């Protein structure tokens, strides 16, 4: 179906009272006065402003923030150098180099993610088969140089060790949906 936004039914004639009403409207600024009144009403409401940084905007456990590399509860790195994260990474922001470790484990020697190239889409954390790479909820990591956003394996492991108390809780809260 459809409806008219500006068409009006038939005619309302030209009556002296209607003419006087229109003349009063465009001589005494009635719509202007009512617009002033409801802007005054918003002057008298409560502002919707939170007190940053002492108050933070609400979020969800699904939030895709700063990247991090997790661990098993034993302490072993969860990553097994399988390169699906860089295979699926739509911005090609992940570079991985790998070799067998001294005990023969399949581990990475290089795991670099470029924050300046990353689009923060979570494809790595949803393609990771062992929940190694995650987009933890950190977003307040703005840097003063372009280099500091060029993360490597040591920086990502440090982020994972720092945010493990929250990343694991978010994964516990949300993993039944995914």
């Amino acid at each position: 179906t459809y409806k008219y936004v500006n068409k009006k039914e038939q005619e309302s004639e030209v009556d002296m009272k209607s003419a006087t009403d229109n003349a009063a409207r465009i001589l005494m600024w009635t719509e202007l006065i009512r617009g002033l009144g409801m802007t005054l009403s918003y002057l008298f409401r409560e502002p919707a402003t939170i007190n940053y940084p002492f108050e933070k905007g609400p979020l969800s456990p699904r939030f895709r923030g700063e990247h991090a590399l997790r661990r098993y509860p034993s302490g072993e790195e969860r990553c097994i150098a399988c390169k699906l994260c860089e295979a699926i990474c739509p911005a090609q922001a992940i570079t991985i180099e790998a070799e067998p470790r001294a005990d023969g484990s399949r581990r990475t020697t290089r795991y670099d993610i470029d924050m300046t190239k990353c689009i923060y889409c979570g494809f790595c954390q949803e393609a990771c088969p062992v929940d190694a790479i995650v987009e933890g909820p950190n977003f307040e990591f703005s840097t003063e140089t372009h280099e500091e956003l060029l993360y490597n394996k040591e920086k990502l492991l440090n982020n994972g060790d720092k945010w493990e108390a929250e990343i694991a809780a978010n994964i516990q809260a949300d993993y039944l949906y995914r």
Binding site: T95, R110, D112, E147, L150, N152
Partner: protein, 126 residues
């Protein structure tokens, strides 16, 4: 009235916009790509491919990434025919090296050869 004659080799290098270095100094390869021997499928050996000669890839001083200086490093073009690839290469002015399609030779496969009376094709295991 609306049909003229041209007796040339269809050179469009002045309109392609490519710099003259990446026209004159480049060599292209026209070939059916070889089957990846780690698999047995042959669907990737159906179409002709043109690629360019490999240029320098060095190491980034900051991250160790593979830095390059030529734009035609990931340029691979797909053709349905060797003559189509030839026409495209001569039209774009690139010097070409072409190798013919390596087809697998037909083989006489016989399951009964594994159990021969006198030939050496009899197997000792299965």
């Amino acid at each position: 009235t609306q049909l003229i004659t041209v007796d040339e080799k269809l050179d469009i290098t002045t309109l392609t916009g490519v710099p003259e270095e990446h026209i004159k100094t480049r060599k292209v390869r026209i070939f059916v790509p070889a089957r990846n021997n780690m698999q047995s499928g042959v669907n990737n050996t159906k179409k002709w491919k043109m690629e360019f000669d490999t240029r320098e890839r060095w190491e980034n001083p900051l991250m160790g990434w593979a830095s390059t200086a030529d734009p035609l490093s990931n340029m691979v073009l797909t053709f349905s025919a060797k003559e189509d690839a030839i026409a495209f290469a001569e039209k774009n002015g690139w010097s070409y090296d072409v190798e013919e399609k390596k087809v697998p030779k037909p083989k006489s496969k016989s399951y009964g050869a594994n159990f021969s009376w006198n030939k050496r094709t009899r197997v000792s295991t299965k």
